[PDB]
Write a protein that binds this ligand. Structure first.
Ligand code: 7WW
Length: 279
């Protein structure tokens, strides 16, 4: 298979320029995937994911969120989760109009998994399948009470205020992945800001009450040795969602970024097998 990338943009909320990739395989389109990356990264850390999904006949749309990658906006700035979910919704609409006969898959990693979850509970009828990699759906369990207060009280007025260190050595146990993250000029190399912290707290604080609104099938992927987001949070998520077709795949010994781990091809084969049979 050859899966070709085309780069496009749209005006996001606040008239921020949002850049996105579309990855199109040279086969009949079996479904569309709308993909949300996580904190401080960007959609070009997902080329290999899009290429594997294309080998299965899937067209992948992947945006750089505001404040990330090639998109506009102050770096890592957000004042409400709805900014991220609104731009994600715009991308879902573009994909839906371009491929109106196709099933729609929403996929997110980490912060992006929080965004996709938040999207899905708001629009539970507007997608067919959800896939989450280590989703940030319990941020209140990951930061100290002091950090949570600071983020909650300051994340609208001073959204760029740094509140929390991120241990980038925890993203992957492949040192080349860590090095490529640290040397990427489009990655955020500073601390977690108050605005993103607040936005993720908005998702986490009510996850158990909102997750019952999910109805569509869900696959969650999580490495057991993830020190950034503990795996027990994904175990709790799958107990709270409404949908009967829900599965957590735990990967023994993997770090946070399961799609970038040495075992990534097995992880991705699992994702493709789960998706394909549900189309
Ligand atoms: C204890 O320290 C930390 C624990 C988790 C994270 N965290 N990482 C991501 C994330 O999206 N990525 C990590 C690198 C790449 O794989 C994508 C999101 C978060 C997160 C955490 C709290 C509030 C808000 C957020 Cl957004 C950061 C520091």
């Amino acid at each position: 298979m050859t899966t070709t990338r085309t780069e496009r943009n749209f005006a996001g909320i606040g008239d921020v320029r949002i850049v996105y990739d579309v990855w199109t395989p040279d086969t009949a389109p079996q479904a569309v995937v709308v993909l949300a990356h996580g904190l401080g990264e960007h959609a070009r850390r997902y080329d290999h994911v899009a290429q594997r999904l294309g080998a299965a006949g899937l067209v992948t749309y992947a945006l750089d969120h505001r404040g990330h990658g090639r998109s506009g906006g102050k770096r890592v700035l957000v004042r409400d989760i709805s900014e991220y979910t609104a731009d994600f919704d715009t991308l879902v609409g573009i994909a839906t109009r371009e491929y109106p006969g196709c099933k729609r898959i929403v996929l997110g990693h980490s912060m992006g998994g929080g965004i996709v979850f938040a999207y899905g509970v708001e629009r539970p009828d507007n997608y067919d399948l959800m896939v989450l990699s280590a989703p940030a759906v319990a941020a209140q369990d990951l930061v100290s009470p002091v950090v949570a207060v600071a983020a909650k009280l300051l994340g609208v007025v001073v959204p760029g205020l740094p509140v929390q260190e991120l241990d980038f050595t925890a993203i992957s146990r492949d040192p080349e992945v860590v090095q490529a993250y640290n040397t990427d000029p489009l990655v955020h190399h500073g601390r977690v800001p108050a605005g993103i912290g607040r936005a993720l707290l908005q998702v986490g604080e009510t996850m158990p009450r909102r997750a019952p609104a999910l109805t569509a099938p869900l696959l969650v992927l999580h490495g057991t040795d993830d020190r950034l987001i503990p795996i027990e949070g994904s175990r709790r998520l799958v107990e709270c969602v409404g949908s009967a077709d829900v599965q957590l795949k735990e990967y023994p010994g993997l770090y946070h970024e399961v799609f970038n781990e040495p075992e990534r091809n097995q992880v991705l084969d699992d994702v493709v097998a789960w998706l394909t049979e549900r189309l």
